[PDB]
Amino acid sequence: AQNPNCNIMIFHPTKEEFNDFDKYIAYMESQGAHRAGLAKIIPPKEWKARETYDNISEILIATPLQQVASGRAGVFTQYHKKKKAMTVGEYRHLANSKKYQTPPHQNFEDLERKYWKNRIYNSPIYGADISGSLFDENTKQWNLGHLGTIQDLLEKECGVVIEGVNTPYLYFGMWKTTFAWHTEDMDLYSINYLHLGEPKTWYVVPPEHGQRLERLARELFPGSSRGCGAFLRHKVALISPTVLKENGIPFNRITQEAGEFMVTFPYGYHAGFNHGFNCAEAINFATPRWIDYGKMASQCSCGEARVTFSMDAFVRILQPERYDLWKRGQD
């Protein structure tokens, strides 16, 4: 079995190897990359996502989210308070303000210590989930706006044509902005490209050990657990590396820098934070290996998790028994 300790793998494809996206994913899996839940891909040195980032300031963040925490430093929830619209240029100035900017630090490890010690005492503002793309249309390799769609994968594997579309999303972050512990909708893959700015630190649990994280989360968030049988789908809960280590949960960590891709694999729980002002682009995708994970994915039916139009068809075709109750949650 390749990668039996489920370490995060880092890949350096040549420009020749960067032509065929599906084939490279399948290569990474042949080497065991999926067992970690997360992989890093450093693009060939010849490749670029676009020529410059000089003209992005007039992108609108229609609903910036202030991430307010409750709990203790290593075990907390966050809720998202909606703020007034602002442009990317306005958001960048805010991120660089004395109130919100990254503190002085020695290295990524010292910054990580400061994040876990102090996150709960501040409410950073995240420009998340903005439909759009920063890839130049002439970028032909690993362009997240040009990938094969999950609806077309389901049709190719299963023979059933379904409605729905699959487009990317932009994330504009600042110091302390936080992504809570989750897997993707329908336990899909994700791919994330850090276009610009400061790094993003990731934590991940190997897919084969995901249920250990779920059982800890039920213990640590006991009211949330009684409210919903899949409450990590709400994307609100944080658990620190120190707490995970104290409870014996297997995980790994890695920092992504500008210019690098990360891939999350089906049923790979992940969480993380931004080091400063940055912009990332991400999308879900599928391969033939995903289909069995899609059939088994948990679902929120309490009504909190409220997801896309396109997830309807996935539930309807892959999980017909759940269909009914899940759509009651979505309506």
Ligand X SMILES: O=C(O)CNC(=O)C(=O)O
Report which residue type is found at 271.
A
Q: How many positions of this chain bind ligand X (CB under 6 A)? A: 8
Nearest to 172 by CA among 284, 57, 24: 57
Shortest reach from residue 307's CB to Zn ion, in Å: 11
In a 10 Å sphere around its CB, with 0-12 CB exposed, 13-18 middle and 19+ buried, how is residue 289 labelled?
A: middle
Q: In angstroms, rounded to a whole number, what is the distance separating the alpha carbons of residues 16 and 142?
A: 12
Closest CB to ligand X among residues 190, 319: 190
SS3 6: coil
Shortest reach from residue 89's CB to Mg ion, in Å: 8
- Residue of 28, 304, 316, 330 that binds Zn ion (CB under 5 A): 304
What are the CA-CA distances from residue 260 to residues 68, 111, 151, 177, 251 (Å)? 29, 20, 27, 19, 21
Residue 182 assigned to a binding site: yes
Closest CB to ligand X among residues 29, 185: 185
Closest CB to ligand X among residues 254, 282: 282
Closest CB to ligand X among residues 265, 326: 265
DSSP string, 270-300: EEEEESSSEEEEEEEE--TTHHHHHHH----
Shortest reach from residue 146's CB to Ni ion, in Å: 20
Residue 158 assigned to a binding site: no
Closest CB to Mg ion among residues 91, 285: 91
Contact range with Mg ion by CB under 5 A, out of 2-10, 49-57, 180-188, 320-328 = 49-57
Spatial CB neighbours of 297, under 8 Å, sequence gap ≥ 6 = 183, 186, 187, 267, 319
Tokens of 331: 């309506």
Q: Is 302 in the site for Zn ion (CB under 5 A)?
A: yes
What are the CA-CA distances from residue 226 to residues 153, 221, 232, 315, 329 (Å)? 36, 9, 12, 23, 16
Which residues are documented as binding site for Zn(2+)?
228, 234, 300, 302
Which residues are documented as binding site?
126, 182, 184, 192, 200, 228, 234-235, 270, 300, 302
Which residues are documented as binding site for Fe cation?
182, 184, 270
* Residues of the shown chain interacting with Mg ion in the complex, contacts defined by CB under 5 A: 56, 58-59
* Residues of the shown chain interacting with Zn ion in the complex, contacts defined by CB under 5 A: 228, 300, 302, 304
